[PDB]
Each structure stands twice: as C-alpha cells, then as structure tokens.
Structure 1
C-alpha cells in the first residue's frame, strides 16, 4: 500500500541490493502501520465490548 512516490523512489535505485533493501524497508514500514492500525482498531473494538453484554441481550430481546 506504499504511495506512488515510494514506488518511484524504489525505481530510482539502480543497484539490485539497494532496491531490494529499500523494498524490504517499505514492506516493514507498511507492516508496522497496518499492525498499529489493527491493534488500535482492536482496542477500540474491545472498548465497545466493554459495554456489558446486557446490550446484546437487549438486542436479542428486541
């Protein structure tokens, strides 16, 4: 999901090891951002779940 600017920067690199290392770094950064977003979403989601299950029971009763 790296931006087109990142792809252009990767294409700029000439040496195969240099471009491979840049691609690996971009992969690591994208993975870190995705993991941060997923953990943050999970925290917010549990915070919803912190609502006492009586909300689910009320939903079933309705």
Structure 2
C-alpha cells in the first residue's frame, strides 16, 4: 500500500539487490502500518467490550 513515490523510487533503482532490498523495506513498512492499525483497532474493541461489560456488571449488581 505504499505511495506511488515509493514505486517510482524502486523503479529508479538499477541494481537488482537494491531494488529487492527497497521492495523488502516497503513490505516491512506496510506490515508495520497494518500492525499498528490492527493494534489500535483491537484495543478499541477490547475497551468498548469492557464498557459493555461495565453495564453488564451494573446489571448483575442490580
């Protein structure tokens, strides 16, 4: 999911090792972005479920 500028920079690379290493770096960057999004989400669902559980515990107390 990297920006088109990254693709242009990869194309500009001539040596095969350079292009492959830059592609690997872009893969790692996309992996990091996806993992950050997944972590932020997962914690958000965890805490919203904990809020619904707060209400559930209030009902149990009632």
Please report the TM-score for the alignment, with normalisation by the length of structure 1: 0.81
Q: Is there any run of 5+ residues in structure 1 with no aligned partner, and where?
A: none
Partner of 2:26: 26
Classify 1:3/1:59 alpha carbon distance in 2 versus 1 (closer, same or farther; 3 Å): farther
| Count of aligned pairs | 62
Deviates more, 1:47-56 or 1:7-16: 47-56
**1:9-60 deviation line (CA, Å, top 9, x unaligned):** 1000000010000000000011011101101110011111012348689999
Please report the TM-score for the alignment, with normalisation by the length of structure 2: 0.81
Classify 1:59/1:34 alpha carbon distance in 2 versus 1 (closer, same or farther; 3 Å): farther
Q: Is there any run of 5+ residues in structure 2 with no aligned partner, and where?
A: none
Give the number of the structure whose residues are more often helix, by fraction.
2
